[PDB]
Amino acid sequence: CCTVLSAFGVVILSVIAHLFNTNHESFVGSINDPEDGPAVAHTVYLAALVYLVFFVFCGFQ
Amino acid sequence: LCPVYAPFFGAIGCASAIIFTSLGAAYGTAKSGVGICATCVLRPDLLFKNIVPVIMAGIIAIYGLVVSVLVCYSLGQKQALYTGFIQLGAGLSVGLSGLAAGFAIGIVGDAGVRGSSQQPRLFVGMILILIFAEVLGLYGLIVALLLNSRATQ
Amino acid sequence: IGIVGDAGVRGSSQQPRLFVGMILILIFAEVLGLYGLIVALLLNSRATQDVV
Amino acid sequence: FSHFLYYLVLIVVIVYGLYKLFTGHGSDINFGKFLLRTSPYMWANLGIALCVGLSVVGAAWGIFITGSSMIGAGVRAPRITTKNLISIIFCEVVAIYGLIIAIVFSSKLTVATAENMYSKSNLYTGYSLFWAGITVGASNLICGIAVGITGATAAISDAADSALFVKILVIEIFGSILGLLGLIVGLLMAGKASEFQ
Amino acid sequence: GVYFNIDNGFIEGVVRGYRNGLLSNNQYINLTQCDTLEDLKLQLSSTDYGNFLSSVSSESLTTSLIQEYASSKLYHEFNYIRDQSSGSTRKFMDYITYGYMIDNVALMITGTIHDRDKGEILQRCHPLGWFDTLPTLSVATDLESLYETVLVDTPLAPYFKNCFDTAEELDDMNIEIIRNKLYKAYLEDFYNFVTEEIPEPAKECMQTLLGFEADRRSINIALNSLQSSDIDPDLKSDLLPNIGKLYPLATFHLAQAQDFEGVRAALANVYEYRGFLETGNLEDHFYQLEMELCRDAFTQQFAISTVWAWMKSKEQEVRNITWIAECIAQNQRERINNYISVY
Amino acid sequence: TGSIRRTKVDILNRILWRLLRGNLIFQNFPIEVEKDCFIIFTHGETLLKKVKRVIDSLNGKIVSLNTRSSELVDTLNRQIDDLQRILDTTEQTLHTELLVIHDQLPVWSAMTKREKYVYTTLNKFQQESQGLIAEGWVPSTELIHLQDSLKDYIETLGSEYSTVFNVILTNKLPPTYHRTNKFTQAFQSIVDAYGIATYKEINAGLATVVTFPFMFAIMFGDMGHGFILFLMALFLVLNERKFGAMHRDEIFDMAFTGRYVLLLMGAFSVYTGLLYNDIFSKSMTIFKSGWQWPSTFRKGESIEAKKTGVYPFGLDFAWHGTDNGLLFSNSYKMKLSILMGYAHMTYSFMFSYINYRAKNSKVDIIGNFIPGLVFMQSIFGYLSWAIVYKWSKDWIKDDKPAPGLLNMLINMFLAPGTIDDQLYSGQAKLQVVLLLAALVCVPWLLLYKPLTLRRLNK
Amino acid sequence: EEAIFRSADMTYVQLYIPLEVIREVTFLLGKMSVFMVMDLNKDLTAFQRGYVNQLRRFDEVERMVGFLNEVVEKHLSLENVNDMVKEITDCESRARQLDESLDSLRSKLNDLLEQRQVIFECSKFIEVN
Amino acid sequence: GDVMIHQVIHTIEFCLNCISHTASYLRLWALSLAHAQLSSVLWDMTISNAFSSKNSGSPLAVMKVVFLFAMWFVLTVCILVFMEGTSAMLHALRLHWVEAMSKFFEGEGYAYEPFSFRAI
């Protein structure tokens, strides 16, 4: 079941990292939201790569 | 307007929102777990499908935990009586609702897991009865999460 | 301690291997009073600590 | 031991009232000034919370009364366990009554200015929401328990003979009049109540 | 009926389901039309008895094996209802079996006076009245060495309060006295338990079902004492229970009842037992009144007296099936319709 | 020395201690049903045959040796293995016999399961004149199939005694049979769990096939959870051939019997969570907003938005991180539930008229449908119209007070003709007409049908 | 037609099956799956039904197939049924007697394994003392 | 007497249910509010904590995001899909069984189950 969670971890976190990179107002637009967009995108995109490693490793099971 | 005794009601609402909900969840776990342990000494292969009442009782306690956490992030030293009594209402709502829903899940669950071992057609019956008793905690969670949104306005 | 130890004394006259289990459950029942002791000693240590 | 406390509280109330009355200070036990000086948000939020609480403790009460006997009566006759779920439904609607009254009451719950805080209207709409939450939560409590009892009898008379459930569903209808009447009365009581201003 | 279904919700609805398996009058007429015990087995197989004599197969099928298995499934249904009971309900279920424990004690200590073997005087014992030291009543003869060795750890121990052991060991004359006196103290204790802890709808209709047991036992003691007893009334009054409808004025006249008319004129002053001693079979009168008192105990819903009213009605059902199967196996059909059916 | 069950060791100890007052040294050693050993040491005499009546009563087997503890062990191990070999012979014969049976029980069982089913049905026939009469129901499409299959079969086997196949015009209630494919089977089972419909009544599982996933989706509104549910349903729809020839346990049989109720429950949940801005509780800035925020404002202060236009499809995304956005969502979803419940009820109420028209009963129409229609539509049809008409008017450009619709329906029944906030022109005199039309149907629906069934018996 | 909006059109036909072709017509109607029978003789009891001596037989044989299904878990024309019910009965008899000569022998085995242990655990008690 | 009493019960039941079902369809708003608010306060507790512009690219700050996404996803699947949409499913079911199948549905019939060897 880790491959399903890992595929959603690729897709959802890649979309979230792209929405932090382009300064989308549903993620950056508030005062309580983080200030720097690509600084959060750089640490969400690496998590997308980590879940892609889990998806490739559990895809050969 | 914002007295010194005003965060008593919010702190006691945050208390009661997990206290009464955990009392209801404990009744729903214990009374329906007695039925699981009594049923599964003669027919033990029904052990992991009879586990649904204690899971629903756990969902009740999660509903109470959500309100307690969301009340304790709006507490302050100098909040008004408006915020204090609205946190009190948000605590009482999910408290009485989780307590009632946990009592109902406990009393329905052991009877259901006892009737499910004699008649196999009663598993869908006990699940469809327990889903009505589950959402009563949701019916208090709605009022709790609506009174939370009117905390500081 | 009382409502465990009565059943443990009722049981450990029939089964000799139940006596160690009785002692272990009574240790778990007596550590509750030990925890109350620890809370009250840590509390009483702060009773007159820098109090004006 | 509870009767000892009921007698002790009664003796303390009588001794305190007669001591306060004999010494010429009997107007110091002043319930009207207590009503004038407590915050209206207490009564309003307490009425909303007790509305949605006591509707659910009657709904969940009736659900186990006509659920446990439905499952017990369904062991020999399992052809009731889906048709007779309308007895769960009739005692479950008394919770949605209290929910949709609690939200309508919480719409009347704003921030009142401190200069007009214990005014006529702000105190009126605390009293009205308090007693109109009580009269809905208690009515849905009693209606849920009555519909649960008359559904627990119906769940066993259904398993006895199939033609009896239609005849004893009528008693559940007359029992479920009560929560709808409480739904009406709690909307008429807080009908003229304004927001907190 | 507001706090009943917490611990007794599943228990009642299964017992109410067990009530629907009581044979009606048409299901008894369809049993009286049978020609063979095999035809009666196949007629019972369409009821809620279905395939209870399946391990018999038409050769070893006697009219006592039907009474064995039909009552055995009653006992297993009673054990299933008792295993799901807790609290005051489980104690109420235990107090029912105490009256069968008394009969098994009085049947076990008569099989040792006659020196009959212990393995065959226990298959005649009642399965619901089983306690763990029941076979060990074959160790002594006198009452004191059977109480102080065996019957202290039993729940029949508070009931040995008036059994005076004068160091005469046992004949058949005083074991019946001990039986009646244990049942007297048991009827007292179980009436006080029903009055004390059983809730109010299951209180008034259980006090009547239990006072009827006391009245029937009083009339049977006061009427069986004519033929096979020569006792004083001051010693006879310790055998009559004092809980019933018949105690304070009529059991006095049943105590000094030296003749049949001393019983009949004593039972003519009580209103619902007059006419029982005039015409017909008296045992059928008591069983008919028992079933009429058990019928209107199912009509009150949220009551734990439905368990008593179920098991006595199911015992009468097993007795009626046994009487019919005794009629259609011995080819006597002059009184096949002597069954009792109120359901 | 002997054996005993382990649950009777304490009661045997207590009975022997109450029999011999003291006077014993009682041990027990567990034999490794579970059992136990015991040693007594009856110190004395005259009770030695009475201890044995305690032991043999509760099924204890005394083992007296009296020779040696090393000579009986040899003669007993010369029987343990000698009887274990008889076990190994007879159990080998048992497992030899079970080989020809375990691969044959699905034939012997399936013969009896249908042979008993044949004779149970043959008990349901007449046996009148040395020939059975089988009366029973068959759909009209399969009449010619019976008359072509029964006619060919009795002639192809010889046995020249032909059957007689008649069609009886009767009046008892026929069975109901809804011809469902794999799409409408789950909805049919769902709707037949509650109540089996009467003969040629309108099927309630044919409006269920859209409304049940849609009333689901109104409660379950999210494009993220809806796409997950649609995906785990489409996994079962695309793999319905491997899962059909498979043993399904009850929960997965429930989930796979309805693999098309969940596909629609996901497909409508995506639609309605695109109507809301709710994608794992986030908004979608797809279209152009109808609200603009001010450009120059101080940090941390409460600001409002000015209305530019209206959002094209669905709810607007400027309500997301909003203090009073939940009030607007409460108003919208409450009135949404009112209008969709009104639509569902007034759609399912027309099926009653179609039923009474198919039964050709104008008495039932004028007694139940019309007094029901102009009672429902005159109160809650008016409420559902008033919601739409309040949405249609502006109430700010007009400088008029926006009426409250709760205390409009409260005051329509309590104080007729008094309108505090006017909602439309001619409100105070039309609400009296609607109130009288609703109140006239409480005696009319109660008194039309019995008093005209009584009149048709004269 | 289709019958998803309303029910299908039922007819209540009446057959007349002779006794020469009776099993063949009944097994044909069982395979066609179109004819829903109705119990005409409701007033008759459980016996006197006409086909009760042939139904108690396949109740008994159902019980015997159930016994064969329990032993493994524990470890057509009329003549073609009549000679296979013979090999059901002839094998149920030998399986029942071989199982009853096996559990009553396991009990005799345990009655000696319990007698060996009460000698091993009571020679040890004397060797200690 | 069997028609007049039945029509009185039908009138009382129908006039009760016209009010009692239009207030019972407000569970379409109740459970929608519950689903939206639970999906909001699960996001805000799980992954709103994982979003920070500090330690960008650090191993701790990315294992934070991995663990909080896993905790978010298993809670969404376990609650907000399986143990919330089942309740929404059952509520849309009772809205059909009571609020829709009482306006037109009589339901006094018996199923067509023919003499078939494919059902034994």
Side-chain angles (χ1 to χ4, degrees), chain F residues 230-240 243-294 296-297 299-305 307-438:
Chain F
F230 178 73
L231 188 63
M232 67 180 287
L234 182 142
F235 180 75
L236 273 68
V237 172
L238 294 178
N239 293 318
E240 65 183 0
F243 290 159
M246 187 180 288
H247 181 73
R248 278 91 68 193
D249 54 351
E250 187 177 3
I251 298 169
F252 184 72
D253 198 2
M254 185 67 73
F256 182 72
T257 303
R259 80 273 199 187
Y260 291 102
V261 306
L262 272 73
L263 182 140
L264 292 173
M265 282 189 284
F268 287 118
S269 180
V270 174
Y271 176 76
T272 186
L274 196 274
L275 285 173
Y276 308 117
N277 294 122
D278 200 69
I279 174 69
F280 297 110
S281 71
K282 285 293 183 183
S283 291
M284 287 170 282
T285 65
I286 297 169
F287 297 102
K288 185 179 184 293
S289 180
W291 296 98
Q292 63 179 356
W293 295 101
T296 302
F297 63 96
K299 184 177 179 180
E301 70 182 2
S302 180
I303 57 171
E304 291 180 354
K307 182 176 182 292
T308 299
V310 63
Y311 194 74
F313 191 82
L315 194 145
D316 190 80
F317 66 95
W319 296 99
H320 183 270
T322 302
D323 294 333
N324 59 0
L326 189 57
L327 280 74
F328 183 76
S329 71
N330 287 322
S331 297
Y332 161 66
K333 292 180 183 180
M334 180 178 71
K335 295 176 179 180
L336 171 64
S337 300
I338 292 298
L339 267 69
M340 295 305 292
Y342 167 69
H344 194 192
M345 287 167 67
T346 195
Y347 178 72
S348 67
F349 190 69
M350 298 296 172
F351 289 159
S352 66
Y353 176 72
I354 300 169
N355 287 319
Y356 300 133
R357 185 176 175 87
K359 290 186 286 185
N360 198 0
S361 65
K362 284 91 173 66
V363 48
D364 287 328
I365 295 169
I366 306 169
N368 295 114
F369 178 71
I370 303 297
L373 195 276
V374 300
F375 181 77
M376 185 184 289
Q377 298 299 110
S378 67
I379 299 170
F380 296 108
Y382 177 71
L383 175 60
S384 299
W385 178 75
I387 293 170
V388 177
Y389 190 77
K390 187 180 180 180
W391 282 343
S392 296
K393 299 285 103 176
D394 199 358
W395 300 108
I396 296 171
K397 185 177 180 180
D398 293 331
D399 287 330
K400 293 183 184 293
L405 270 67
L406 194 277
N407 55 3
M408 184 181 73
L409 270 71
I410 293 299
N411 290 319
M412 191 178 75
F413 290 95
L414 270 70
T418 64
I419 305 300
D420 52 356
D421 289 330
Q422 186 181 4
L423 191 142
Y424 62 97
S425 296
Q427 181 178 0
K429 64 179 72 65
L430 183 60
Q431 287 183 354
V432 176
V433 175
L434 294 178
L435 177 60
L436 292 175

Side-chain angles (χ1 to χ4, degrees), chain E residues 212-226:
Chain E
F212 174 72
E213 296 291 327
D215 297 340
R216 181 177 66 188
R217 186 58 173 258
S218 298
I219 295 168
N220 287 319
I221 289 165
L223 190 61
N224 290 320
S225 179
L226 275 72

Side-chain angles (χ1 to χ4, degrees), chain D residues 81-133:
Chain D
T81 190
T82 307
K83 179 179 72 176
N84 210 146
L85 196 65
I86 195 167
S87 64
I88 303 292
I89 287 162
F90 284 168
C91 67
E92 194 270 332
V93 75
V94 302
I96 203 72
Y97 289 164
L99 180 60
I100 68 171
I101 277 182
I103 302 170
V104 168
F105 287 178
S106 69
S107 68
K108 292 179 183 291
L109 187 66
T110 61
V111 178
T113 310
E115 282 82 4
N116 49 4
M117 175 63 201
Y118 294 98
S119 178
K120 183 174 175 66
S121 178
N122 289 319
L123 197 63
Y124 179 83
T125 188
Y127 296 156
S128 69
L129 293 180
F130 176 70
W131 290 106

Side-chain angles (χ1 to χ4, degrees), chain A residues 9-10 13-14 17 38-54, chain H residues 55-63 65-66:
Chain A
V10 174
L13 291 174
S14 65
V40 182
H42 187 272
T43 189
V44 174
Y45 183 71
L46 290 175
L49 267 68
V50 168
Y51 281 106
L52 194 146
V53 171
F54 282 107
Chain H
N55 296 114
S56 66
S58 295
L60 183 63
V62 70
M63 293 297 171
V65 177
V66 171

